[PDB]
Amino acid sequence: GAPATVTEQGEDITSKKDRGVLKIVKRVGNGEETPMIGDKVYVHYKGKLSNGKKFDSSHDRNEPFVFSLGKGQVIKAWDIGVATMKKGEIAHLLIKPEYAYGSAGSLPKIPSNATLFFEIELLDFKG
Numbered sequence: 001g002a003p004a005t006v007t008e009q010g011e012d013i014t015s016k017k018d019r020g021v022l023k024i025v026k027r028v029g030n031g032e033e034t035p036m037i038g039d040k041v042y043v044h045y046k047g048k049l050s051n052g053k054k055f056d057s058s059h060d061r062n063e064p065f066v067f068s069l070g071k072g073q074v075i076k077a078w079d080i081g082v083a084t085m086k087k088g089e090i091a092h093l094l095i096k097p098e099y100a101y102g103s104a105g106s107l108p109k110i111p112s113n114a115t116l117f118f119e120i121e122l123l124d125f126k127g
């Protein structure tokens, strides 16, 4: 399924090239531009542990998730990953714990040393 496909064909978008964040473009977005650090970004997402458990989505309550990019407002993988996305793009990310919740986890939902999977849709971004 979707996580396995990321392993096989995802691009390693980390600076250290440690496969900590792997990305596939599932739906191409519009234009050329991708958000800059400091931009306000609007997304929909679905997340889970890579094994399929602990599913959560912003579409549950059909309300976009908004954050400023590169301002420590989300896990590192999202600051890295969303920065690469075009408006209208849907991406899949597979994330090792070093780029997510690490050894601490986010208990009880997210265990220590958890690998995560996300589907993210970049709806819009603004200066």
Ligand SMILES: COc1ccc(CC[C@H]2OC(=O)[C@@H]3CCCCN3C(=O)[C@@H](c3cccs3)NC(=O)C(C)(C)NC(=O)COc3cccc2c3)cc1OC
Binding pocket: 045, 046, 047, 048, 049, 054, 055, 056, 057, 065, 072, 073, 074, 075, 076, 078, 100, 101, 109, 110, 116
């Ligand atoms: C700079 O580092 C951090 C900055 C902020 C946080 C707080 C958690 C933060 O959530 C996230 O960063 C990620 C990506 C954005 C969407 C929510 N996140 C999730 O991991 C998902 C997951 C879904 C499935 C498995 S994990 N969390 C949720 O969907 C739920 C469980 C609903 N919780 C929240 O969304 C809580 O609301 C938040 C609001 C802002 C930032 C974060 C969470 C943790 C950070 O590092 C550990």
